[PDB]
Amino acid sequence: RTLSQLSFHRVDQKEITQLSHLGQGTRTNVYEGRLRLRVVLKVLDPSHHDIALAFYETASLMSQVSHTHLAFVHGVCVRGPENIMVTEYVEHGPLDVWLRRERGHVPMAWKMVVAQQLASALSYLENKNLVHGNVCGRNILLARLGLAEGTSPFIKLSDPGVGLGALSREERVERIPWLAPECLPSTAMDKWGFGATLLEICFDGEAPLQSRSPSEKEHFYQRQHRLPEPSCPQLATLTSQCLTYEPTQRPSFRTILRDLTRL
């Protein structure tokens, strides 16, 4: 343990202060903190080496990319038996939580801005041949709200947490319909994730299949059922192209981004 062949900044525990609990991610508890910067501390549960390795791989890869719409990763701290990823605090938190609270008065124009910013971030990851693997409204963080007159939203995509490759079948099923179908048993999976996230954003933060059970979610992919049409009709062609069960038929993010700018 503590791989020694990945590149990430090692944060000393004397440099971080842990403040309030914010929520949970997959096998993590996340806390507001300070880095002597306003940060978020993502404390991994006591885990087997394989899970910790997938956590450190995310930290290393997200430490070496840069983009206007990607949240910073500052490093990893080992505080006793706890691996803690130190990441950027994004002022207004997860998009899906805010959208549900503000449901009914978030205009379509606002959602198209967000879609375009997200597509831009994924276009960059595609060009670098890097998989995110956890594109969803929860992992879209709002840096600027953009509802007030003369303003516009600004989002940052959070890190994917513990790498998808290390997660259990039951955790993968919990991620339906954001999870690409081929992942239930490549950067193409993030096209599906993006498409599902557009449905979520259009539905003001309510994802399709939310009221279903794990077994029913798994059934949905098993029988290759069709996901719903978005409530922004101008996105219906785009979402249908991304939410295709065959991965090679999904369009590239260069095409997605171009199409969004014309919509």
Ligand X SMILES: CO[C@@]1(c2cccc(-c3cn(C)c4cnc(NC(N)=O)cc34)n2)CCOC1
What is the closest distance, in whole angstroms, from the C-beta atom of residue 252 to ligand X in the complex? 26
Strand ranges for 45-144 from DSSP E? 73-79, 82-88, 140-144
**Segment lying near ligand X (by CB under 6 A), choices 88-96, 125-133, 196-204, 212-220:** 88-96
The residues in 134-163 that bind ligand X, with binding defined as CB under 6 A, are 138-139, 141, 158, 161
The residues in 63-82 that bind ligand X, with binding defined as CB under 6 A, are 71
Q: Which of 8, 31, 55, 89 binds ligand X (CB under 6 A)?
A: 89
- Inter-axis angle of helices 108-127 and 253-262, nearest 10: 160
What is the closest distance, in whole angstroms, from the C-beta atom of residue 80 to ligand X in the complex? 21
Q: Within a 10 A sphere around the Cβ of 208, how many other Cβ atoms?
A: 16
Cβ–Cβ < 8 Å for 195, 239: yes
Q: Which two tokens stand for residue 60?
A: 């290393």
What is the closest distance, in whole angstroms, from the C-beta atom of residue 242 to ligand X in the complex? 22
What is the closest distance, in whole angstroms, from the C-beta atom of residue 136 to ligand X in the complex? 9
Q: Which is nearer to ligand X, 41 or 202 (CB)?
A: 41
Cβ–Cβ < 8 Å for 203, 239: no
Q: Which of 16, 35, 40, 173 binds ligand X (CB under 6 A)?
A: 40
Q: Which of 8, 25, 52, 69 binds ligand X (CB under 6 A)?
A: 25
Report d(CA 11, CA 85) in Å as an integer. 9
Cβ–Cβ < 8 Å for 153, 114: yes
Q: Which is nearer to ligand X, 124 or 220 (CB)?
A: 124
Q: Which two tokens stand for residue 237?
A: 């062609």
Element (DSSP H or E) covering residue 29: strand 28-35
Count, residues near ligand X per rule CB under 6 A: 19
87 binds ligand X (CB under 6 A): yes
Which 8-state DSSP code applies to residue 212? Answer: S
Q: Which is nearer to ligand X, 79 or 92 (CB)?
A: 92
Any idea which residue has 């430490």 for tokens? 63
Q: Which is nearer to ligand X, 76 or 235 (CB)?
A: 76
Q: Pairing relation of β-strands 10-11 and 73-79? A: parallel
The binding site for ligand X (CB under 6 A) comprises 22-23, 25, 28, 30, 40, 42, 71, 87-90, 93-94, 138-139, 141, 158, 161
